[PDB]
């Protein structure tokens, strides 16, 4: 993770405009409807079956919310990712046995959400700098498996 | 496999973003450069920089390949078997690769028509996008 | 694609495996359980230790599926589309663990079979179940 | 990386045996034969065309060499993967933009050519004990992009 420093600036700037409520959710649910395959590891969140019930699922918006708020915690520490997500790296490795792929597959779709609600704003510029962050992060969070 | 609704949201979507097809082919590219540097090891021969003529160009040829695929959604192999030799056969592209354009193109797409990019039609341009690229690299397997 | 060539080479081997099949089901997927973990998953109902009766009789169901495809490589989805719907309806398997399982049914060939295991054989039978893997995860797409 | 004791026994037991001067060339062969737009890396090579035109290749057989020997250096190192790898993971990705996915692909290939050789000897327990440390050497080898 480098993030130069117009890089930070880029990043920091755009999230503070995130409505961390929505965003999760929106994030959560789009991954369940585009790769099906994800939902098996939700079988407790109730139903599933269409992208109705998804997107109105309310398990889904408080995970969600959820998985944001991890998201925030990186990026105050952007330069101790590892760190910040050992514990968490246990648990989808260990405890969820989550393949990484995945890890990247919902940060692609965070981006995907986020220049949905940002149009213009989320230039070619500021699009790099997250992708690197959504790296840095799936690759904190693989970490217990290297 | 690209079921009645798929191509459907599809069409639609292709109808909708028309006359800006080879714009957004060219800022996909850009988005596509910046974000993953090891793409434009394929374009030595191009002056990569942002506004770039050259990147402006191939981008509307690209455009113009994905809107003649949306034409002919039930035959993609026959569409698009000459490009298919040239990705295979003469470029010799990373398979790889196509997931990185494909995601651009996604969120180049999210950027412009915000309105018309509901989780189900992200999931069957997802679909769409994938498509083209196993026809594009079909030659590998 | 799947050309003469690859069809010969398929049909050949599977004929020198014969009546050894069912065992090297059992072992890929002792292989695929010991060197990716993540893959036991599935499987919480069976009793994953090596010699397991569970695991042997899972792995003849295996290899006879992989037998009927060597019988009909013409129409891979045809004779597939009761196990594609298990797996990607039912099962929800993560499409990864396919590459996973069918690197340890190659060596597990190549551990039985050295002398028929040569590179052009060895790009066959990867091409057969990359084939296979692909029609297994087709609702996916 | 882990490897319990008993892996390191497995691993460095069987490796006595292997002729790096012939396991080298055979898995850069197959790499080339059965994943194509890899071959786009080595047009320096001369002929690649055809299966037996890369299994004849002393450049293939060459290089191979010398890819097998890092492998021992990396066997030698195995607590420190990391360091060991660090000037040809910039490299790799520095200078030769190769896709990380590669780097497995490699390793796999690899292991189906030892498995090739050993028979019997390259049980399930030998394997995943390889399985580890091929996926170490990789993700050593990626470290430039983390
Ligand atoms: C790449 C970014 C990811 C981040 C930042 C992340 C973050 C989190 C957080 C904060 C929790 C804690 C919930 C708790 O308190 O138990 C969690 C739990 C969990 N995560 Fe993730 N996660 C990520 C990716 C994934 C993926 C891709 C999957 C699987 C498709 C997944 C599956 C799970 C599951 C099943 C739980 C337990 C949920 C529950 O039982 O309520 N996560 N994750
Ligand atoms: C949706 C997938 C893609 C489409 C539809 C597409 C389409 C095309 C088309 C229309 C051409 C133009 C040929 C001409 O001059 O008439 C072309 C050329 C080319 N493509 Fe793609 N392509 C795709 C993916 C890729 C990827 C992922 C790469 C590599 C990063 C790539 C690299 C190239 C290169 C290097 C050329 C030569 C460009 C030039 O010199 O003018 N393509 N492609
Ligand atoms: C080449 C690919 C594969 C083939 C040919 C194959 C074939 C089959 C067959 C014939 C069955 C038996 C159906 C039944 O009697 O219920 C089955 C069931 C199943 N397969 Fe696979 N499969 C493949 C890959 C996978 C993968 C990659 C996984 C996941 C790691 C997997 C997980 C299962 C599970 C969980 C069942 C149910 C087993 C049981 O309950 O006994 N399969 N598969
Ligand atoms: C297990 C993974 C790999 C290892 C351990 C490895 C190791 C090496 C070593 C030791 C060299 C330097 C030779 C010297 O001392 O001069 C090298 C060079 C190189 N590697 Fe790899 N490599 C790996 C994977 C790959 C892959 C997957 C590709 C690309 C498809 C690749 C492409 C090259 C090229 C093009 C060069 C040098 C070009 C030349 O000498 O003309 N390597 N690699």
């Not at chain 1, 930070?8 to 405009?17: A, D, E, H, Q, R």
């Not at chain 2, 009645?4 to 639609?12: E, L, M, R």
Request: net charge neutral; proline share 4%; with cysteine.
């Amino acid at each position: 993770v480098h993030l130069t420093a117009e890089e930070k600036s880029l990043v920091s700037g755009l999230w503070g405009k995130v409505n961390v409520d929505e965003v999760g959710g929106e994030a959560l649910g789009r991954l369940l409807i585009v790769y099906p395959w994800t939902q098996r590891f939700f079988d407790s969140f109730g139903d599933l079956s269409t992208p109705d019930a998804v997107m109105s699922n309310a398990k889904v918006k408080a995970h969600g919310k959820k998985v944001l708020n991890s998201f925030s915690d990186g990026l105050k520490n952007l330069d101790n990712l590892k760190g910040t997500f050992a514990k968490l790296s246990e648990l989808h490795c260990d405890k969820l046995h989550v393949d990484p792929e995945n890890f990247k597959l919902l940060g692609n779709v965070l981006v995907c959400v986020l220049a949905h609600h940002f149009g213009k704003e989320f230039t070619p510029q500021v699009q790099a700098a997250y992708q690197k962050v959504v790296a840095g992060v799936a690759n904190a969070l693989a970490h217990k498996y290297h | 496999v690209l079921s009645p609704a798929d191509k459907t949201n599809i069409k639609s979507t292709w109808d909708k973003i028309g006359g800006h097809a080879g714009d957004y082919g060219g800022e996909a590219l850009d988005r596509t450069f910046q974000s993953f540097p090891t793409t434009k090891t394929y374009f030595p021969h191009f002056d990569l920089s942002p506004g770039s003529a050259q990147v402006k160009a191939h981008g509307k040829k690209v455009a113009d390949a994905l809107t003649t695929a949306v034409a002919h959604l039930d035959d993609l192999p026959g569409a698009l078997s000459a490009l298919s030799d040239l990705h295979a056969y003469k470029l010799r592209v990373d398979p790889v690769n196509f997931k990185l354009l494909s995601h651009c193109l996604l969120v180049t797409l999210a950027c412009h028509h915000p309105t018309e990019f509901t989780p189900a039609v992200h999931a069957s341009l997802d679909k769409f996008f994938t498509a083209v690229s196993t026809v594009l690299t079909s030659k590998y397997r």
